[PDB]
């Protein structure tokens with residue numbers, strides 16, 4: 001429960017600042033101690049993932065053809081299917097969130113800023129609900145910060 005809210009805040013803040021072209025955001029009270037360092041790490045690693053995988057991200061975004069809220073809702077099916085296929089690791093978790101930021105930037109360009117918070121919830125549901133046991137074993141977001149040790 002606490003992990004869900006903490007994850008939702010980190011993911012929501014990162015998607016929102018990526019879409020508005022911001023490098024920071026105010027804490028919303030649910031991310032706690034680990035929140036600041038997690039978002040700082042996610043900005044570093046996440047920005048890098050979007051840069052290094054830009055052609056693949058542009059290709060997939062185009063194929064997904066996201067124009068509105070109904071299209072955003074439809075993403076959860078493929079999101080859970082792809083994210084559940086294969087190994088669990090921090091690298092894949094960053095790819096999931098980074099693609100979310102890449103989609104959020106797209107949503108802002110097409111005046112669909114209202115879809116960003118629903119998308120963050122979609123991503124948080126997939127991440128936390130399918131990886132809760134693994135996240136607990138890694139000490140969640142403290143594990144994330146330590147793994148990348150930026």
Ligand SMILES: Cc1cc(CSCc2nn(C)c(C)c2-c2cccc3c(CCCOc4cccc5ccccc45)c(C(=O)O)[nH]c23)nn1C
Pocket residue numbers: 053056057060075078079082083092095096097099100103123
């Ligand atoms: C959507 C999809 C993805 C694939 C993998 S091939 C594309 C591809 N090539 N490379 C080299 C990379 C890095 C990707 C790629 C592109 C986009 C996302 C991912 C993911 C995360 C899981 C799927 O996440 C989402 C699916 C849909 C909408 C989403 C909207 C917001 C946030 C996440 C979303 C991975 C991975 O787990 O390794 N890899 C990704 N197949 N499909 C159908």
